[PDB]
Amino acid sequence: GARASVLSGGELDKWEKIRLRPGGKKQYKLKHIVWASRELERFAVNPGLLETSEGCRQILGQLQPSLQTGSEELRSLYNTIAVLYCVHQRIDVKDTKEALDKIEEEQNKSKKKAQQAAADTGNNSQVSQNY
Fold this sequence. Notes:
The PDB classes it as virus/viral protein. The chain has 5 helices and no strands. The protein has helices spanning about 10-15, 30-45, 55-70, 70-90, 95-120.
């Protein structure tokens, strides 16, 4: 498309502003987007639907667990998706780690919100012992 479907020209220019490594000299680009797209399509995921911050977040959440024991490439893909999502939400980034920490922080906060929320309006209990 004129300005792709995932990210527009400008969005792509910025998307290609994130570094792959903190001590490295790599950055995102249409190449990475194509790679991710290839993996997405190969994973049975729609690329266009990956344009929405929701779809990006969904994928990230889909690999979230796959990360537990995912591959190096799979992990890198997840990070890339996270960055994409950040751009979708209009989040500034510098490195893949930064974006990862950004999403990691947000997510963590989210989980908490869920906890504090439940607690606030809920309850829980437990027990365990043996002599």
